[PDB]
Amino acid sequence: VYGGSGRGDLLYENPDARRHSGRALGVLNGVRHSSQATMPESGQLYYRKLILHSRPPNGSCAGLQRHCHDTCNWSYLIPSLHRCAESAISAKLWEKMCQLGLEDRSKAWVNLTQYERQRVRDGQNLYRYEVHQRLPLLEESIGWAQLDDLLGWFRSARRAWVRLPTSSSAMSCRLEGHADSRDTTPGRNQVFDTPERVEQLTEATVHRIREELQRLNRSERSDCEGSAAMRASARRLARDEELSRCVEEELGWHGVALQ
Amino acid sequence: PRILLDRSLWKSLWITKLQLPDINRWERVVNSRRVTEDRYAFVEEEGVMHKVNWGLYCERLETELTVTQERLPQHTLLMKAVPSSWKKLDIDISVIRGLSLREAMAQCKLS
Amino acid sequence: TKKSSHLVLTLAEDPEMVLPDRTCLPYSSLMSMKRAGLSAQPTVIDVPAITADGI
Amino acid sequence: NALNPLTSPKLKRPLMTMLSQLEYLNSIDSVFILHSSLMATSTDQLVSAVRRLPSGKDSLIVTMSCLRALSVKSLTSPSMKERIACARALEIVSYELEKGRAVLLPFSEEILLHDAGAYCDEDLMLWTVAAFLARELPLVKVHTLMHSNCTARTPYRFLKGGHNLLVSSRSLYDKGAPLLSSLHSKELRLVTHNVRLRTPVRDRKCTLQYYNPIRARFVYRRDKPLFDKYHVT
Amino acid sequence: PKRKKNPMQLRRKVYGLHFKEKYLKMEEWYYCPLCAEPKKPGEWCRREDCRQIKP
Amino acid sequence: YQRGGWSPGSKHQKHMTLNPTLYLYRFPGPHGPGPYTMKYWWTLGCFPTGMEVPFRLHEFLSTYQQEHVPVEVEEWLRCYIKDPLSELVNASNDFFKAVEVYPEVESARGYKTLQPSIAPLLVPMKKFEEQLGVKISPVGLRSVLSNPVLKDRFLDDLFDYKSYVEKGGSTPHRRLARSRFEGSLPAETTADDERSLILLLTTISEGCINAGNYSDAASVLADALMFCHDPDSQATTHANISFASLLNADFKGAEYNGREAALLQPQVKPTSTACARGYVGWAAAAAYQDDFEKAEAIVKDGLTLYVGNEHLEKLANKLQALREEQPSVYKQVPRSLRESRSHLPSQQSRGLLSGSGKGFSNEFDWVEFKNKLYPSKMDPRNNEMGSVFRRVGDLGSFISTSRSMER
Amino acid sequence: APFKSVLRRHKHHPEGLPLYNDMSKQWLCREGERWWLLDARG
Amino acid sequence: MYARFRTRSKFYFRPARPALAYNVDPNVMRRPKVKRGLLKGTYSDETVDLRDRERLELLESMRHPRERDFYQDHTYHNQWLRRDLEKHQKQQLAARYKYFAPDFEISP
Amino acid sequence: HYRAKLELDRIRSMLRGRARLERKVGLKRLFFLMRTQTRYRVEQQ
Amino acid sequence: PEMAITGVYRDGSERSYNTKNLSPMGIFLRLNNLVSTANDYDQPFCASHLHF
Amino acid sequence: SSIFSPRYDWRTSGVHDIAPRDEGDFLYQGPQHVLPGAHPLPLHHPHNTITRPVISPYIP
Amino acid sequence: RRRTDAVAMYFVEYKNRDMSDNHKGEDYSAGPERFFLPPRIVETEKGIQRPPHMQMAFDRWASKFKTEEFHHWWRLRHAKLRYWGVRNVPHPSDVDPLWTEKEEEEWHNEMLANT
Amino acid sequence: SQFLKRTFVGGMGYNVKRPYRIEIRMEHDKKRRMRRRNIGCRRMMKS
Numbered sequence A: 001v002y003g004g005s006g007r008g009d010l011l012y013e014n015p016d017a018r019r020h021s022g023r024a025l026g027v028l029n030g031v032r033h034s035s036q037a038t039m040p041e042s043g044q045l046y047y048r049k050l051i052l053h054s055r056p057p058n059g060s061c062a063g064l065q066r067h068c069h070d071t072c073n074w075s076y077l078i079p080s081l082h083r084c085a086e087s088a089i090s091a092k093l094w095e096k097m098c099q100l101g102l103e104d105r106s107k108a109w110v111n112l113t114q115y116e117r118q119r120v121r122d123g124q125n126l127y128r129y130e131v132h133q134r135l136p137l138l139e140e141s142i143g144w145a146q147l148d149d150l151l152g153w154f155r156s157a158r159r160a161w162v163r164l165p166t167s168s169s170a171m172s173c174r175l176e177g178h179a180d181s182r183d184t185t186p187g188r189n190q191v192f193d194t195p196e197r198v199e200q201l202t203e204a205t206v207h208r209i210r211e212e213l214q215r216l217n218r219s220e221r222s223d224c225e226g227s228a229a230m231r232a233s234a235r236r237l238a239r240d241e242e243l244s245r246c247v248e249e250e251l252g253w254h255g256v257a258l259q
Numbered sequence B: 001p002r003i004l005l006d007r008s009l010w011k012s013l014w015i016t017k018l019q020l021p022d023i024n025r026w027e028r029v030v031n032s033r034r035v036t037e038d039r040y041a042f043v044e045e046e047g048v049m050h051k052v053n054w055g056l057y058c059e060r061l062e063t064e065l066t067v068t069q070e071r072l073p074q075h076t077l078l079m080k081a082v083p084s085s086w087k088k089l090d091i092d093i094s095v096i097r098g099l100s101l102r103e104a105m106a107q108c109k110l111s
Numbered sequence C: 001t002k003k004s005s006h007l008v009l010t011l012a013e014d015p016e017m018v019l020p021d022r023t024c025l026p027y028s029s030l031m032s033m034k035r036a037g038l039s040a041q042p043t044v045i046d047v048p049a050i051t052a053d054g055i
Numbered sequence D: 001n002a003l004n005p006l007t008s009p010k011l012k013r014p015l016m017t018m019l020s021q022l023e024y025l026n027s028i029d030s031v032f033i034l035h036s037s038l039m040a041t042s043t044d045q046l047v048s049a050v051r052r053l054p055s056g057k058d059s060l061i062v063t064m065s066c067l068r069a070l071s072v073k074s075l076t077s078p079s080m081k082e083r084i085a086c087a088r089a090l091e092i093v094s095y096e097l098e099k100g101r102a103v104l105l106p107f108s109e110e111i112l113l114h115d116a117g118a119y120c121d122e123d124l125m126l127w128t129v130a131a132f133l134a135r136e137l138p139l140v141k142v143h144t145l146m147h148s149n150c151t152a153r154t155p156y157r158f159l160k161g162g163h164n165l166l167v168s169s170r171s172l173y174d175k176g177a178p179l180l181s182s183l184h185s186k187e188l189r190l191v192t193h194n195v196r197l198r199t200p201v202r203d204r205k206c207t208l209q210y211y212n213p214i215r216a217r218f219v220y221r222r223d224k225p226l227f228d229k230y231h232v233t
Numbered sequence E: 001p002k003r004k005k006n007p008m009q010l011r012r013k014v015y016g017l018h019f020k021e022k023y024l025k026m027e028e029w030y031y032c033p034l035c036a037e038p039k040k041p042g043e044w045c046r047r048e049d050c051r052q053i054k055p
Numbered sequence F: 001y002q003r004g005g006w007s008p009g010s011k012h013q014k015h016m017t018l019n020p021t022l023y024l025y026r027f028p029g030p031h032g033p034g035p036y037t038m039k040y041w042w043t044l045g046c047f048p049t050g051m052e053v054p055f056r057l058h059e060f061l062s063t064y065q066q067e068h069v070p071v072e073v074e075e076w077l078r079c080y081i082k083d084p085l086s087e088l089v090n091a092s093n094d095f096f097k098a099v100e101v102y103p104e105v106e107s108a109r110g111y112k113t114l115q116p117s118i119a120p121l122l123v124p125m126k127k128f129e130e131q132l133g134v135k136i137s138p139v140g141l142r143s144v145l146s147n148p149v150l151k152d153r154f155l156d157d158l159f160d161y162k163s164y165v166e167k168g169g170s171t172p173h174r175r176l177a178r179s180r181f182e183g184s185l186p187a188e189t190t191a192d193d194e195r196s197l198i199l200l201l202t203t204i205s206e207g208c209i210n211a212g213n214y215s216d217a218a219s220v221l222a223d224a225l226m227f228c229h230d231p232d233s234q235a236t237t238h239a240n241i242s243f244a245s246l247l248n249a250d251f252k253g254a255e256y257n258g259r260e261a262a263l264l265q266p267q268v269k270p271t272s273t274a275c276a277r278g279y280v281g282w283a284a285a286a287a288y289q290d291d292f293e294k295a296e297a298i299v300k301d302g303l304t305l306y307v308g309n310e311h312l313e314k315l316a317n318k319l320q321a322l323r324e325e326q327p328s329v330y331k332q333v334p335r336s337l338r339e340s341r342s343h344l345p346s347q348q349s350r351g352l353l354s355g356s357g358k359g360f361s362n363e364f365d366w367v368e369f370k371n372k373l374y375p376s377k378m379d380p381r382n383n384e385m386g387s388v389f390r391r392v393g394d395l396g397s398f399i400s401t402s403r404s405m406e407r
Numbered sequence G: 001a002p003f004k005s006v007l008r009r010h011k012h013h014p015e016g017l018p019l020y021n022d023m024s025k026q027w028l029c030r031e032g033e034r035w036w037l038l039d040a041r042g
Numbered sequence H: 001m002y003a004r005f006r007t008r009s010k011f012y013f014r015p016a017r018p019a020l021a022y023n024v025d026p027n028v029m030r031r032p033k034v035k036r037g038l039l040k041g042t043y044s045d046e047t048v049d050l051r052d053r054e055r056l057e058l059l060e061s062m063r064h065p066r067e068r069d070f071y072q073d074h075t076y077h078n079q080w081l082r083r084d085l086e087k088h089q090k091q092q093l094a095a096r097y098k099y100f101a102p103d104f105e106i107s108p
Numbered sequence I: 001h002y003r004a005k006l007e008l009d010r011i012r013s014m015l016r017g018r019a020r021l022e023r024k025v026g027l028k029r030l031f032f033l034m035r036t037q038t039r040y041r042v043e044q045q
Numbered sequence J: 001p002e003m004a005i006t007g008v009y010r011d012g013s014e015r016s017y018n019t020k021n022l023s024p025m026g027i028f029l030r031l032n033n034l035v036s037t038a039n040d041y042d043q044p045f046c047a048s049h050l051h052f
Numbered sequence K: 001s002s003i004f005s006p007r008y009d010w011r012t013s014g015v016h017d018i019a020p021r022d023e024g025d026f027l028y029q030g031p032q033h034v035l036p037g038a039h040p041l042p043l044h045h046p047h048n049t050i051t052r053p054v055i056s057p058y059i060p
Numbered sequence L: 001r002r003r004t005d006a007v008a009m010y011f012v013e014y015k016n017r018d019m020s021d022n023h024k025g026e027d028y029s030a031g032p033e034r035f036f037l038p039p040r041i042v043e044t045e046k047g048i049q050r051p052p053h054m055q056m057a058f059d060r061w062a063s064k065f066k067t068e069e070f071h072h073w074w075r076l077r078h079a080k081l082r083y084w085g086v087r088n089v090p091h092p093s094d095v096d097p098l099w100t101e102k103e104e105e106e107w108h109n110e111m112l113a114n115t
Numbered sequence M: 001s002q003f004l005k006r007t008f009v010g011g012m013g014y015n016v017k018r019p020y021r022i023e024i025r026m027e028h029d030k031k032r033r034m035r036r037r038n039i040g041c042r043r044m045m046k047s
Ligand SMILES: [Mg+2]
Pocket: H076
């Protein structure tokens, strides 16, 4: 869990399976007893600890002396989802889909080719996977998020054509599989109720957007009262108007209303 | 061979463009034919292995690593073919490791 | 064997870094400058901040 | 959690504590346990430690014993550098605990964790936490932020007790033994690392005004042919 | 009758003082009060100021 | 005999009777062509053995085939350049969006938080710079974004500039076009877009000064001075350039801009203090050049013009504090010692970066002569012992020197 | 692997040789010690 | 006072990488395709190769004046005897100019 | 002739220096160690 | 398919046996070995280890 | 390797991913669960009358 | 220090610069533009005059280098030092003469300014 | 390098044949200039 992949990483790296090597396993670095020659007893926790903690820091470990990345920042996690949606669905495909959805309201699907349908489906699938992988860091950093990224939380879903679940739609059901066989290994951060946690994250981010708007308006009113003059900047007025329009538009697209 | 896939070897060596016409496509033998699907990758999601598009997955990993290394607040420079033996260069680097820019430049100019 | 090597160099920003003082001059230099007539301490003049009021 | 019962409100992050967030520390990759001896003449290592908190894979364990030691040696210390460093460490740890990036070991959880009847201080509670999570969460890399001169850095020769016949080298991996019984063996030191994250810059202070055996020869040396217009005695 | 030396026999030279004083050592310097350049006491510049009053 | 490999690239002893090889002076090793052979590849044109065939197809493809364009196509290439006004509008919109989406820095307690890097801002600002002819400092931009009030000023000025350019066009472009047309066949006041542009550039320069990059601050002020055609704006910009040059230890430019701001007094509005700031900068440049009597005369004239503005009064008090001690030590500053002592850390950093070190970057390692590097011997400005110019001889023309032993 | 350093405490070194009654090691114990009095008369 | 120096074992023993049999890397079809050095941790914002044409003066400045290099204007061996290129260069030629082969044009 | 090369190559991490770096030296070292430890366990421990 | 049999335990541990060209009786024996062991420790059988 | 060899069972982990793929993997229901491919006899070519149909009056 | 052998360099001069007939007001902070040109002079001592015999000797020695045979010697020295393995020596095609007509004209103007 | 020269760091011996081969090569260069041959370096590869 240390060397291979962390909490919010996207790369699936099985630490015990060396599927990325180009050579047979010659020397085992972390070995406690010579008896581990013909039986390393890997999989046991106390031995795999020594086996994995002796690995060098890779591009995801960010070693002790090397400066680490602010990965747990909402202002980084939201543009990451937006770039995922962009790489999934191209610009021309996005424009055509917007035109078709505005002209027929999900009735002109016959116009798109099968390749584009598969591109949209694969994009939704990859976006759901990335949301699953980023959910812990998101719910951790929701406290100090900023309004632009709070709105990008919905912008990215809309761009990926994924309607967020509220209590097309892709976060509505769980991945099928019996509980007696699922990977319930501790230490592997994997949520099991995604339609239940993404919904509460959406509700929390709507509440956070409302709080941020109220705080901004209250700060502006306090500054105006302290200045004792009705002099609002044109930049601030235009910004307030455009954000007030964009927020309600992109929340109504998903179905959530700001009240 | 009865059925020769494009990525298999027969009287030939491995050439990337010849054995992999499209790296996002995966060829196989379905009903005594060459049937090509979209290459995928298995990822852990909700305790099970799920199939994602391999090309999109690799592009996402690459772009994420690049943007993280970019927005990391530092600057790395790789100067290749330095006219010095690596032993002597490491000798001289040991004195400059763990300094400030001012002290590093000062020691370099005074040595 | 004409040997050559590669060099990796990373510069990072550390706001908590405190550099030692390197402007301390020896007593010999101080009293020589005094004998010449130069001030032992560098002349510093307050410079007003940049203002965009006239525009 | 995998068993969905349905098939058959506002979320807010509370104060991070170890015993209540054991599930979080197991997903976390690396855990650095803070020690008050690190706050000697500087706080740069603590700053470099809290810089790794926004990585999402690193955690910081600060105990109430550590906080009490910090306050004590901030109020009573013959070194103003150490007093200032400990006060700054207090404010940094307070900010981190208020934001929710570092975890805290309150006194109640310290009671719940430490072995029964054993006196604990900062030095012993450090290794108590270390042994606990090295025995219970083996897949977490544990580091200790201590001073180079700290005597608690080597527990098997300074904190080790007597020649106890009821302890062995495997007293760390058996769930029925007390946590402090692991002090006698080197396995705790094998599984726990003591690292200096980022030492401040190695730039030497100004030593022009100290005695120099190569500059002392020129004190009484004749330098008439060295000057033209500004001869000084 | 010499034989190949192991890495530990090679590093023994580092333990001595003759190796550290030649390679691993820094300079005591200050800013030239006239040229504003790093400077070691005892050596001076080619300059009519730094030759009369040599700091 | 043959205590190693047999190929010429091997590393051990060989012999001619058993392993005869042809004379190979220097050739690339088993891994790749080293710099010792690439030197020959770039100077002589081939590796110094002559057995290697020069294969420069890749660099030919990279340079000549790329830079080849048929004349019939390049005749029309210039007729499809993008519209400058639309390019400026799009660049301004993108730059404004990228600056607005910049996150606010969170102030931590006990330590300084690292500012978020300007990753998505270097390209939009690059397009803005290349479309407007003015370069912006990235350090100054980062500092303005870190500063909350400077960020608001920059946002407001950039929005005003966007609106003015989108509603009326580009006044600098109009001025250049009208000047070119008049040259092929007067001067209006500073327009609103030009005012907003010089305002945002002044904000960028103030942020760059708060950072500590005086050279870039002065450069931004210089390229902003080219957009003001109003006396008030010109006086303010000249005072700003004078202060920036004082900080950057550019005493000549500081004095010039200060006296320019002072000369802009008669045609300026009486409320402005740009002329007072110009007098302050002029006197400060004089004092830094160690002309104390000149600085006193300048500050006295400045006081008489402006009866005692606070900046002039503080500068006069500082000059008087220096004058109450200069005759107590030397009665004056010596003429051969003026502008000799360093006073600011900017010139200290500049000397650290571009000084002469022990062994290299001095007059004994390599000398420059018309954009070419020469050894210490071949120095045309020096005939010291060890130079090649002491072995020229009389050249069979006439006995130039009376020296009997040499030359 | 363990490593016994070549730079060892010497009899001619100013740091000198230690007293094992004062040292603090893992293999030294002074808890269950007792003091006996032996008489060598006869 | 003294900086910490440590002799590196890679400078004492570093063999060659394992070569590829039949030019096949055995895990091409198994591992993802990411740019080299990213997952390992090798990253660089700027790469200055001192073997380029624009870095020649910098290379010759960093070199020492004592070390001399001969045959700067001439060459011991005659460079006007025609001889074949290197194997990789001939392979580059064959891979780039494939229409030079006889009867390469499709008919009809 | 069997020398347990594939089995003893996994335990070169427990050695140090040239035995850990180079394969032949480490194999000889581990072979000697296992043989001597077997002897000691059989007739001396 | 991977010719191997894996056992996942309640403490998160895993134990795999190789079953390439192995009889079904041997596969059954290794499966019973999996269900018998707990995969929590690996200690020698010595006098100082007879008592845990 | 050979079954009577130390290198036969030296792979202890990493062979199987703990997570099963949600497309083909299933659980063992019990004795009445008809598993595809399972047969008591060792059949290196497990075919039936559907994959390899026989052409004869009766099934052998 | 001298880069070739890392030897310590020393500037040796005479003390009474102002009391001298020659070298009165000469500035040695930086060398002249050419080795045959008169040395630098401070702005304060621009009107200084030199002894006529030394002036004539210096003028003869400097006019020695104003010929084309010196340019040929210069290019031949380039060729010799390039054949001898000395680096950072340009090609005699890329070299340019130390003394040209316009440069000599402006140097004569500066010499008449310094009188 | 004072401490190094004191503690004899480096080869206490030195080359002995050079102070004569140098003047031999200088005389040979004189002879080459006499015979109108280009002067070559004494040690092109023995360096
Ligand atoms: Mg010939």
